[PDB]
Amino acid sequence: DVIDGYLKVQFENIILNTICDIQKKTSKEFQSHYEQTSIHDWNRDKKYLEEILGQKHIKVL
Amino acid sequence: SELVVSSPNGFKFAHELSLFSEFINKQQWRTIIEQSALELENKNEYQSAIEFWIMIEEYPRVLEIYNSRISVLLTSISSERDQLYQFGKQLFNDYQGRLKTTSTARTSYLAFEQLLKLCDFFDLYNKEKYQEAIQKIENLEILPISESEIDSKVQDYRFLSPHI
Amino acid sequence: TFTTSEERIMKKIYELFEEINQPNSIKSKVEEISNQLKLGSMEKEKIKY
Amino acid sequence: TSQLLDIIKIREVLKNDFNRFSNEFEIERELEECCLINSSIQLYNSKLKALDGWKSFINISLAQNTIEIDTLDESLLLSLLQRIVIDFSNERNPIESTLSIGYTILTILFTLKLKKDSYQLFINSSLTTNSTDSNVIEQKMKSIFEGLLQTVLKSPHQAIRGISYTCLIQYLDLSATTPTTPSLSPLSTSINNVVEMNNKSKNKNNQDKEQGYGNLNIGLIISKIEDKFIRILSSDCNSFSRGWRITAISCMQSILSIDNLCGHRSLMFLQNKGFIINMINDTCSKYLSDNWENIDPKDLHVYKSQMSLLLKISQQMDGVHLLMNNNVIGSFVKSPFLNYIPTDKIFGKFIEILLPILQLFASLCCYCNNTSKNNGNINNNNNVGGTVLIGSDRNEIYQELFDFLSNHSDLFIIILSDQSSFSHPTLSSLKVLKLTCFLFSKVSSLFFKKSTTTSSSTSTTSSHNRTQFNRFHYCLINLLVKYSVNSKQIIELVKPENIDEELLTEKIDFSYRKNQFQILIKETITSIIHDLLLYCRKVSIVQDSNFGFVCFNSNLILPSIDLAINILVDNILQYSFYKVDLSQCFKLLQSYDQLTNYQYQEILQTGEDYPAFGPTQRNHMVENILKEKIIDIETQISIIHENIEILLLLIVSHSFYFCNSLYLLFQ
Amino acid sequence: SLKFSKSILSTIYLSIVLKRSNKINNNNQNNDNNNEINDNNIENYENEYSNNLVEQFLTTFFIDYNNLFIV
């Protein structure tokens, strides 16, 4: 359940595409935020071990 | 505060830290209670956090927490709902003098004294006491009983709390 | 009349004309390198060992 | 129908009730008035005929591509668009006439996007060094935007606002600039030399002004109208029927991508109207209740657009705060849908509803990292109390996610075993798995703590928490087996679910041959392996650098350390490949006007249409495809370097753990 | 218009010359003193602005349009 009749469909196609564009756009933005987050988490969680290894290295001397 | 919130006597120990006044001045003591109360909210220990906020007389936050956890639980048939409801009936018996005075949180007290009647209404609905349940929601003033009340209650609703 | 392929190859004949003839063209650059040559500016000094 | 006055019936009744008139010259004048009114009604009807002819003539002269889009003059099209946007703002419109103008505005904006996304706009006015001509182009574009906003502010008519919302989206997609080129980092430059700091202000003080002025002109239009425009739009986002509700919600997403330039005011205005919590409650009750199987597919697009607006909010610092200040995780986690164990006849509709929730929950983890720049330059009392996320707030977000994953444990065990009785995996089950492994990597440190805190009380609960931990741990470790070893077979077994993914299954990648779908699968698998290795690192190496749980056993049941060594070698090989492939993509970008017609087919892949495109069009399309594919590759190069460092750390920590564990048997 | 053009250029030449003498003096005094709202910000702002202005003035002179040397 549901010239000018073809123009109706072309205007509806343009509205549907304009709605699809943003949902694809917001999704590539989300992918880029996800990947920058795990890169930031790694370099944060890495440095925390560099500082703890300093806090173990000295203790043998 | 890590010590006080990890203590299996935490509230009693936090009160005992008010006596050690030569080691902890009352400003440091109040802020040990502030940090301990927040680090009980961070645990979902809403009752423990409320008794800590009561220990420093911060009655706005007591009403803010209580209304927030009881609204999210209001209709639920759960042990936390009934345990928090009897705790709320104690806060109504003994603390209502202090709670009914504050300049801030006045609407939070009106909401507290509406939620403690809505819990009593759902208590009777969930126990088939429908004639007593009707009388609990009538004596709550939040609904119209006649057509002649509708534009009043459609205005009164705009001055409730966002927990009702 | 034109065909779409004739319109399109006539476009490519114009596109390849302009790159050769505009002020920043191939023709200009091949006179500047020629000017820098006349004016000695590429004859770097011959150090000997 | 159109009504005219019956001059015959009127003249007969006026001659029957003649008794009202001083003489017949008055009757014949009341008939003159009726003949004049009929003449102006006839002219009104023919002006409306002529608009309906003119609109259908123009939209057919565009929507068939019968005029070559390169040749279509933007100076003419913007002068037409600026003219007709004025009448599209007139409160004395016909509805029919204002709609006929609106659909013609829409086609002109769409044809201008189809020019931008094939050719550079306005080239004839960068070939003039006239600062006047670009000023005239902004003044036309601005006169269109301030006009489309007037049609929203004035119109009561749903479809006239709806068309203006589609036109405002296309206008903001037109005005947004293409990405700048990536700034290559010469990593070896470590020694002493002094001078070339100070000249670096100048050139950014230009390009940041020149991108700045257009975005500040849009911001200095929105920030005059704000309190009325976002108020009308947030009303329409809940007051409109189905299809136009989606258009208003898409318009709100496009505005929130720009609200940073106002200062997060549209976002703050939505909370100052309860719109965020009201849209959360509108979402959970209607799409995440027990009747989710019965959701109408026309309004499943209303769900997807509502979720894409929550996803657009969580892409901002203040937006993560405002989603937790409406209990987003806890208010989705209470909803009946998440308790449902999926069964085969319905699995696709379950994934369509679960995937946007897992995107939103992954998005809330992202911002919680920027705390590290507190250089105390004291001077000035600008008491703007913006909530820098505290040591509480990332643990709050991670606790609602821990107790989510741990109450819904059997659903997450069925997701994390990947015991796929579906005889092909799909890319959307991998979209869900990429998000699930990321959440367990984020929450991993609470998974260690809530399974190791031995209180002197209920031994019956601490054993249970540790039994859930052991279940999740063996699933996450067996995924690290399945997705590394069978990696290549999985890329050869996955099928597309959509025509979008079939169109990635025909298309080749010029860097790789594979199809583009076999790369999007593979880079989703890079993502699954990366946060599984971050989970393993956060579970193998504890605070104080004590050892945690064993991810790999000693041998050269858990898997053995051969697995970490083979994953390290394959990541070292992939890191060597992508650096040759990046060293091809930057060479292509350094010679694009000198590539072979075969290399232009290898990059563009536009079928038997490939002949049609002009050189300037192909060169612009390849120059932006090469920008995208350099950013895709430099991103995967980071993720795979960090895999190599995580794997070296995992191999060394396990080797050290076993060597100490053996030494403690010889005293 | 050609008078006004000569008078701009003669005044720009004079400001660049004075700025070149001040930059020599301040470049001595910014070695010598470093080895044993603030109005300072105004001189620094006018010093970058009166570089970038002269730079934009010369690009807008040299980067069809007849180069003013032709005219």
Short mmCIF file of C-alpha atoms in Angstrom, two decimals, chain B residues 42-43 72, chain D residues 334 392 399:
data_model
loop_
_atom_site.label_atom_id
_atom_site.label_comp_id
_atom_site.label_asym_id
_atom_site.label_seq_id
_atom_site.Cartn_x
_atom_site.Cartn_y
_atom_site.Cartn_z
CA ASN B 42 29.34 6.72 41.01
CA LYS B 43 28.51 3.22 42.51
CA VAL B 72 13.13 5.78 36.93
CA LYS D 334 16.11 -0.70 29.81
CA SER D 392 34.40 10.25 37.03
CA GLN D 399 30.13 1.44 33.99
#
